[PDB]
Design a protein around this nucleic acid. Structure first.
Ligand code: ZN
Ligand code: ZN
Length: 668
RNA sequence: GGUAAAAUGGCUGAGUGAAGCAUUGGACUGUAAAUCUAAAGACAGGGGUUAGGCCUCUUUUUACCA
């Protein structure tokens, strides 16, 4: 068979601040993805991108912005069931996939293949790419740029022209004639010879595109007029169709360079991706957030708006696909821009929703509570981000000066971005400590994303370095050490704390826990084992003023949690099914909503928050009846103070009305 | 919400083009059941490749998701 009939280039990352570079090219036979960071897990599977058929994955640089997201792809492939896959990258990239099995578990069932730098050539039936390793004085010094090529395309045969002369078109005799013409050998028929160009268009060798990743001036000198480029710059076998520059805007304006790119010729198109892009590609999420704000602006805050030299450049944006083989031109028929003026149309006119909203407002229309005890909910999914659900983070802000994290995950940084707005830089500075509940990957894979950005935030205002405090099981230390020794230096920003020492009845550890307690003004900190998995642990917070909150998360009912949870103003509990099957508890290793409600009733706590929900089937939580005002429903991007309890019970009717039709488990 | 198998008629087996059971008048049979020389409904709804078999976007059915 011949080469692909159509080739499309698609942009995934779009140069967003919350994620690294990422480029997607669609081919008739194979799917290829270049580079990927954190937050892409939603970008794909939200814009209808097929996970399957991604047998080949490519990436650049070892930094988390381009290697962090591989765990999600591996997990999806394991769930998807793809038989084989191929992964390529820097020579020392095998160490990254060596340590994934530590917590993600064995990858047996799907085969992954890697290759060294000794084989810089790879070919298949529809495409070919050449990789050029690059060495720089100032592994973070290797970026290995990529080059792409396309197989020759055979010009369409003129079957109608053959029929006009008198050839036996429409039968089995024409097939050998067209097959011979395809090979390029003329055939003489009826005493006359017909040239190939007469019966078909001239062959086209095929276009190509190049990708570069110059991050700073360290890599400019090694790449300056590279030998490989001299054999392809300017006129070549075919003109260059498109080019993408991942370099930052600062590198663009430098006097040096900015002229080599022009050597490719005016016909060569160029693109730039960087943080200055307007983006705004959260249509459905933004609509849901606006609806929640309309229900009650105070309870549910609103996301902030993230808004925006010899040849022209088309700034990259959302789903700016490019067409290669049919014709070299751009397409913008899939623009994804938020339109609140359209969101309000359906937010203020849902069936019976307006009546419930107005009734709740009239009903709403007991002394002032404490001003700045704050708990913020970031994510309410389970190990799989989706339209409106993602791995939970449970941001807590005990005081404006000091902040704490109730576990963390991937995509939480993107969530708090476009939300805190200008205050994002200040919020990260207030962060003083973090910790992990159990060994699940989704609960600890988000630490690097927060840490690397907090490192920049600390210097953004010229404050002294303050290493972050991390409390996680002793197993998490191995992965952190491997990453420190393999990809980038992060040890100085993390201080491990075993959770065993915090158990009831159990110099560096004591001084560090004392510093944590005094910095955030916490009277005491306690942790206990949970019936969830090996080395699983919980936590409890008690304030000097008598406020107590205990986080349980994934856990089966146990006596220790109940004993520690006695006289607790608030607590976070996990739900799996609401109403349904009570069997196969061992498979889930999680509590049940009815049992959670019973516990909360007997917990003596005045209110119980339901945050973590299983995401096997996309459905709003069908709240189990036989409950009280103590229980509640927790979603993403929530706000209020400690004493703002009486508000949320009245939000139940409007909250249910907003969803209207519910898509829950059916007999199928 | 995601993954896996079929969209051909009253039913099924496939991709050179379509075939058996059944029927419209019945021939051997007083009798309407046995055996045909003719008949018919015909590959879900779009398009990219210029041909069906390939891929792509909804629609129906079944199963699975830790
Ligand atoms: Zn969980
Ligand atoms: Zn978990």
């Amino acid at each position: 068979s011949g080469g692909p009939n159509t080739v499309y280039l698609q942009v995934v990352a779009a140069g967003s601040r919350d994620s690294g570079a990422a480029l997607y090219v669609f081919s008739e036979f194979n799917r290829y993805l270049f580079n990927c960071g954190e937050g892409v897990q939603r970008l794909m599977q939200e814009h209808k991108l097929k996970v399957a058929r991604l047998d080949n994955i490519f990436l650049t640089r070892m930094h988390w912005s381009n290697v962090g997201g591989l765990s999600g792809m591996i997990l999806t492939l394991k769930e998807t069931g793809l038989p084989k896959c191929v992964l390529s990258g820097p020579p020392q990239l095998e160490k990254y996939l060596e340590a994934i099995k530590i917590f993600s578990g064995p990858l047996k069932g799907i085969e992954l293949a890697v290759r060294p730098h000794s084989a810089p050539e790879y070919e298949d039936e529809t495409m070919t790419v050449y990789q050029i390793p690059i060495h720089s004085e100032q592994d973070s010094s290797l970026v290995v740029a990529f080059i792409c090529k396309l197989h020759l395309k055979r010009g369409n045969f003129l079957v109608l022209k053959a029929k006009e002369m008198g050839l036996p078109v429409g039968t089995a005799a024409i097939a050998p004639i067209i097959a011979a013409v395809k090979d390029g050998k003329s055939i003489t028929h009826e005493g006359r010879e017909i040239l190939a160009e007469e019966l078909c268009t001239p062959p086209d060798p095929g276009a190509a595109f190049v990708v570069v990743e110059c991050p700073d001036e360290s890599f400019i000198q090694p790449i300056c007029e590279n030998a490989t480029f001299q054999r392809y710059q300017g006129k070549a076998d075919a003109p260059v169709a498109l080019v993408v520059h991942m370099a930052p805007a600062s590198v663009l304006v430098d006097s040096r360079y900015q002229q080599w790119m022009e050597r490719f010729g005016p016909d060569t198109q160029h693109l730039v991706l960087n943080e200055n892009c307007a983006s705004v590609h959260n249509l459905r999420s933004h609509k849901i957030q606006t609806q929640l704000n309309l229900i009650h602006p105070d309870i549910f805050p609103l996301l902030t708006s993230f808004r925006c030299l010899s040849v022209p450049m088309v700034q990259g944006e959302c789903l700016l696909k490019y067409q290669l083989r049919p014709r070299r031109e751009w397409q913008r028929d899939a623009i994804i821009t938020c339109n609140p003026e359209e969101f309000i149309v359906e937010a203020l006119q849902l069936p019976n929703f307006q009546q419930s909203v107005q009734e709740y407002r009239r009903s709403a229309q007991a002394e002032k509570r404490s001003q700045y005890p704050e708990i913020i909910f970031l994510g309410t999914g389970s190990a799989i981000p989706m339209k409106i659900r993602n791995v939970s983070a449970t941001l807590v802000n005990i005081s404006p000066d000091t902040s704490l994290l109730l576990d963390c995950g991937e995509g939480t940084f993107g969530q708090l971005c476009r939300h805190y707005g200008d205050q994002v830089d200040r919020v990260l500075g207030t962060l003083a400590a973090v910790f992990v509940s159990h060994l699940h990957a989704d609960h600890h894979t988000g630490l690097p994303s927060i840490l690397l950005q907090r490192e920049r935030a600390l210097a953004s205002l010229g404050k002294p370095l303050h290493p972050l405090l991390v409390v996680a099981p002793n197993q998490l230390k191995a992965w952190l050490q491997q990453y420190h020794n393999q990809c980038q230096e992060v040890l100085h920003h993390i201080s491990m704390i075993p959770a065993k020492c915090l158990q009831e009845g159990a110099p560096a550890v004591e001084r560090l826990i004392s510093s944590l307690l005094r910095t955030c003004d916490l009277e005491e900190f306690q942790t206990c084992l949970v019936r969830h998995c090996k080395h699983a642990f919980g936590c409890a917070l008690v304030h000097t003023s008598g406020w107590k909150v205990v986080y349980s998360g994934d856990t089966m009912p146990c006596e220790a949690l109940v004993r520690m949870g006695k006289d607790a103003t608030l607590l976070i509990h996990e739900a799996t099914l609401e109403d349904g099957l009570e069997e196969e508890a061992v498979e889930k290793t999680h509590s049940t909503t009815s049992q959670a409600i019973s516990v909360g009733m007997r917990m003596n706590a005045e209110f119980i928050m339901l945050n973590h929900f299983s995401q096997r089937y996309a459905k709003v939580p069908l709240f189990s009846p036989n409950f009280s005002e103590k229980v509640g429903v927790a979603f993403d991007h929530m706000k209020v103070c400690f004493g703002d309890f009486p508000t949320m019970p009245k939000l139940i009717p409007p909250l249910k009305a907003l969803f209207a039709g519910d898509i829950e488990e059916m007999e199928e």
